[PDB]
Amino acid sequence: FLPPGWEMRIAPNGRPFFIDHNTKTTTWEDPR
């Protein structure tokens, strides 16, 4: 359901982000 390396994680400020672990980049918007 969630692509390998892609993680849905939140920051303690209440902001959710998708982190791609292979490219190790922070993505805010859903790439679809």
Binding site: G5, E7, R9, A11, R15, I19, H21, K24, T25, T26, W28
Partner: peptide, 13 residues
């Protein structure tokens, strides 16, 4: 634009 913090690695998958 929502502030983006420089990627820090949280618990690895």
């Amino acid at each position: 634009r929502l502030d983006l913090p420089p990627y820090e690695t949280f618990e690895d998958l």
